[PDB]
Design an enzyme around this catalytic site. Structure first.
Site, PDB file in Angstrom:
ATOM      1  N   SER A   1      -0.563  -6.659  -6.251  1.00  0.00           N
ATOM      2  CA  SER A   1       0.797  -6.331  -5.762  1.00  0.00           C
ATOM      3  C   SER A   1       1.201  -7.283  -4.624  1.00  0.00           C
ATOM      4  O   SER A   1       2.357  -7.771  -4.599  1.00  0.00           O
ATOM      5  CB  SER A   1       0.926  -4.897  -5.361  1.00  0.00           C
ATOM      6  OG  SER A   1       2.331  -4.629  -5.171  1.00  0.00           O
TER       7      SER A   1
ATOM      8  N   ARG B   1      -4.603   1.744   0.279  1.00  0.00           N
ATOM      9  CA  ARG B   1      -4.592   1.516  -1.181  1.00  0.00           C
ATOM     10  C   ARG B   1      -5.756   0.595  -1.534  1.00  0.00           C
ATOM     11  O   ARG B   1      -6.120  -0.273  -0.716  1.00  0.00           O
ATOM     12  CB  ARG B   1      -3.266   0.907  -1.601  1.00  0.00           C
ATOM     13  CG  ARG B   1      -3.108   0.820  -3.117  1.00  0.00           C
ATOM     14  CD  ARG B   1      -1.733   0.318  -3.484  1.00  0.00           C
ATOM     15  NE  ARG B   1      -1.488   0.329  -4.913  1.00  0.00           N
ATOM     16  CZ  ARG B   1      -0.454  -0.302  -5.495  1.00  0.00           C
ATOM     17  NH1 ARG B   1       0.408  -1.010  -4.784  1.00  0.00           N
ATOM     18  NH2 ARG B   1      -0.263  -0.189  -6.789  1.00  0.00           N
TER      19      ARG B   1
ATOM     20  N   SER C   1       0.865  -1.191   0.000  1.00  0.00           N
ATOM     21  CA  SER C   1       0.000   0.000   0.000  1.00  0.00           C
ATOM     22  C   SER C   1       0.902   1.241   0.000  1.00  0.00           C
ATOM     23  O   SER C   1       0.531   2.190   0.564  1.00  0.00           O
ATOM     24  CB  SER C   1      -0.949  -0.067   1.160  1.00  0.00           C
ATOM     25  OG  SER C   1      -1.701  -1.269   1.060  1.00  0.00           O
ATOM     26  N   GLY C   2       2.016   1.222  -0.720  1.00  0.00           N
ATOM     27  CA  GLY C   2       2.824   2.433  -1.008  1.00  0.00           C
ATOM     28  C   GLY C   2       3.890   2.631   0.032  1.00  0.00           C
ATOM     29  O   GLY C   2       4.413   3.733   0.174  1.00  0.00           O
ATOM     30  N   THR C   3       4.228   1.547   0.706  1.00  0.00           N
ATOM     31  CA  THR C   3       5.056   1.555   1.922  1.00  0.00           C
ATOM     32  C   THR C   3       6.472   2.099   1.582  1.00  0.00           C
ATOM     33  O   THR C   3       6.962   3.024   2.254  1.00  0.00           O
ATOM     34  CB  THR C   3       4.995   0.136   2.516  1.00  0.00           C
ATOM     35  OG1 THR C   3       3.688  -0.493   2.281  1.00  0.00           O
ATOM     36  CG2 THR C   3       5.454   0.242   3.952  1.00  0.00           C
ATOM     37  N   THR C   4       7.114   1.542   0.572  1.00  0.00           N
ATOM     38  CA  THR C   4       8.536   1.805   0.226  1.00  0.00           C
ATOM     39  C   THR C   4       8.737   3.241  -0.255  1.00  0.00           C
ATOM     40  O   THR C   4       9.725   3.911   0.152  1.00  0.00           O
ATOM     41  CB  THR C   4       8.999   0.864  -0.884  1.00  0.00           C
ATOM     42  OG1 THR C   4       8.824  -0.408  -0.269  1.00  0.00           O
ATOM     43  CG2 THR C   4      10.432   1.113  -1.302  1.00  0.00           C
ATOM     44  N   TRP C   5       7.854   3.660  -1.144  1.00  0.00           N
ATOM     45  CA  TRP C   5       7.908   5.013  -1.719  1.00  0.00           C
ATOM     46  C   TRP C   5       7.704   6.031  -0.577  1.00  0.00           C
ATOM     47  O   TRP C   5       8.502   7.000  -0.484  1.00  0.00           O
ATOM     48  CB  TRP C   5       6.886   5.050  -2.847  1.00  0.00           C
ATOM     49  CG  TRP C   5       6.848   6.327  -3.608  1.00  0.00           C
ATOM     50  CD1 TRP C   5       7.500   6.623  -4.767  1.00  0.00           C
ATOM     51  CD2 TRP C   5       6.064   7.478  -3.270  1.00  0.00           C
ATOM     52  NE1 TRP C   5       7.175   7.882  -5.172  1.00  0.00           N
ATOM     53  CE2 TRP C   5       6.313   8.439  -4.268  1.00  0.00           C
ATOM     54  CE3 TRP C   5       5.207   7.802  -2.215  1.00  0.00           C
ATOM     55  CZ2 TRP C   5       5.715   9.693  -4.252  1.00  0.00           C
ATOM     56  CZ3 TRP C   5       4.619   9.047  -2.196  1.00  0.00           C
ATOM     57  CH2 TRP C   5       4.876   9.979  -3.197  1.00  0.00           C
TER      58      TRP C   5
ATOM     59  N   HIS D   1       3.436  -3.241   9.299  1.00  0.00           N
ATOM     60  CA  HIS D   1       2.113  -3.537   8.724  1.00  0.00           C
ATOM     61  C   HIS D   1       1.166  -3.916   9.845  1.00  0.00           C
ATOM     62  O   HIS D   1       0.020  -4.288   9.490  1.00  0.00           O
ATOM     63  CB  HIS D   1       2.178  -4.637   7.658  1.00  0.00           C
ATOM     64  CG  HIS D   1       3.070  -4.296   6.519  1.00  0.00           C
ATOM     65  ND1 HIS D   1       3.018  -3.098   5.872  1.00  0.00           N
ATOM     66  CD2 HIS D   1       4.003  -5.015   5.893  1.00  0.00           C
ATOM     67  CE1 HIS D   1       3.883  -3.090   4.891  1.00  0.00           C
ATOM     68  NE2 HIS D   1       4.495  -4.246   4.888  1.00  0.00           N
TER      69      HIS D   1
HETATM   70  C1  LIG Z   1      10.510  -6.534   3.374  1.00  0.00           C
HETATM   71  O1  LIG Z   1       9.215  -6.352   2.787  1.00  0.00           O
HETATM   72  C2  LIG Z   1       8.254  -7.274   3.118  1.00  0.00           C
HETATM   73  C3  LIG Z   1       8.465  -8.633   3.154  1.00  0.00           C
HETATM   74  C4  LIG Z   1       7.443  -9.501   3.534  1.00  0.00           C
HETATM   75  C5  LIG Z   1       7.671 -10.949   3.572  1.00  0.00           C
HETATM   76  O2  LIG Z   1       8.708 -11.487   3.903  1.00  0.00           O
HETATM   77  C6  LIG Z   1       6.215  -8.976   3.869  1.00  0.00           C
HETATM   78  C7  LIG Z   1       5.988  -7.612   3.824  1.00  0.00           C
HETATM   79  C8  LIG Z   1       6.998  -6.753   3.470  1.00  0.00           C
HETATM   80  O3  LIG Z   1       6.733  -5.411   3.452  1.00  0.00           O
HETATM   81 CL   LIG Z   2      -5.849   4.039  -3.765  1.00  0.00          CL
END
Ligand SMILES: COc1cc(C=O)ccc1O
Ligand SMILES: [Cl-]
Length: 336
Positions: free
Chosen positions: A181, A173, A67-71, A151
């Protein structure tokens, strides 16, 4: 004291999940009345996760997966570190912005396979062993402002997050894009080890038999806290549609101020075209020890046809629409 029940998923469903998810070898648990879904190690680490001590100057990003975590992490780390692109480039995102509960997803039997495949490289083996260890240990040792990814849903966060009024960014998201995704994430990470097709994955996702589900309860708890002064709730598609507004809004929530020129460098850095070449997307260290499935980098490099993924069928699209209707009827939650 961990306040919620932790129970193994019913025997026959648990057996089928172990056939489809090779990253877990003992079983899956459901937590509390909402039946939050996790691998077995949640039971081992629930107390230490819940007792994690947040600080008033922490920045937490809380999302359902993909849900756009990395960005958002890249954006937030830069906003809080004087747009230090040099340091962002040289330190991996996973050290600048550690993932509190990643260690839940490294099963002892799976770790042993990773170690076998890296047995001739002492530094690869130390790296894999550390993946098994709670991020919380190193977070507790930091003397500078912390950046924490999770999460975990609002109801499973360490209570110290809200007691300390740590700043929380919650990103939501739409379920169609998350289903596709998250399906690719489950194929990409051998810690998940999903082997099946999209329709089988959607069936698990719709039944809240995927990690950090129920999805709709995750979204609803985020939405229910967005009025708190220390919570910023954003929809992924709003964030992506207007980078300058997103960057400014996020900066102002974090109590930082930047020129029009600085906003523009951030907009270029975070643009679709440049971000595809960002180290935080490629994840070259997890790939180096083979925990990332290198045969699943298609989706990483290419993404999905906007509003009509190749994997989507008319039947799954109909089921998403009805599932959305059942869960959002009588709420004011609405995706862009
Ligand atoms: C490092 O990113 C992720 C990896 C996993 C599974 O191993 C689950 C959610 C994530 O955001
Ligand atoms: Cl959205």
């Amino acid at each position: 004291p961990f306040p919620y029940s932790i129970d193994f998923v019913e025997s026959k469903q648990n057996e089928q999940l172990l056939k489809d998810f090779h990253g877990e070898r003992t079983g899956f648990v459901q937590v509390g009345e909402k039946r939050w879904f996790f691998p077995s190690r949640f039971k081992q680490y629930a107390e230490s996760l819940y007792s994690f001590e947040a600080r008033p100057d922490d920045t937490w990003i809380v999302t359902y997966p993909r849900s756009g975590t990395t960005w958002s992490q890249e954006m937030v780390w830069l906003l809080c570190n004087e747009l230090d692109f040099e340091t962002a480039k040289s330190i991996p995102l996973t050290q600048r912005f550690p993932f509190l509960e990643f260690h839940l997803f490294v099963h002892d039997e799976v770790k042993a396979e990773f170690l076998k495949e890296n047995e001739h490289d002492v530094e690869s083996m130390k790296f894999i062993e550390q993946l098994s260890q709670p991020a919380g240990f190193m977070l507790a040792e930091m003397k500078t402002p912390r950046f924490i990814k999770t999460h975990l849903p609002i109801s499973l966060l360490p209570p110290s997050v809200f007691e300390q009024k740590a700043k929380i960014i919650y990103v939501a998201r739409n379920p169609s894009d998350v289903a596709v995704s998250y399906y690719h994430l489950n194929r990409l990470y051998r810690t998940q080890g999903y082997v099946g097709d999209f329709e089988t994955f959607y069936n698990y996702f719709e039944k809240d038999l995927t990690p950090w589900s129920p999805y709709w309860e995750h979204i609803k708890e985020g939405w229910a806290e967005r009025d708190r002064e220390n919570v910023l709730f954003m929809y992924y598609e709003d964030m992506k549609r207007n980078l300058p507004d997103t960057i400014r809004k996020t900066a102002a929530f974090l109590g930082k101020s930047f020129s029009d020129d600085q906003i523009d460098t951030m907009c270029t850095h975070l643009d679709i075209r440049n971000f595809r070449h960002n180290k935080s997307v490629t994840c070259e260290e997890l790939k180096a020890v083979g925990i990332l499935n290198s045969g699943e980098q298609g989706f990483v490099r290419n993404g999905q046809v906007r509003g009509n993924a190749e994997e989507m069928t008319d039947d799954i699209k109909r089921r998403l629409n009805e599932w959305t209707e059942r869960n959002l009827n009588g709420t004011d939650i609405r995706f862009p």
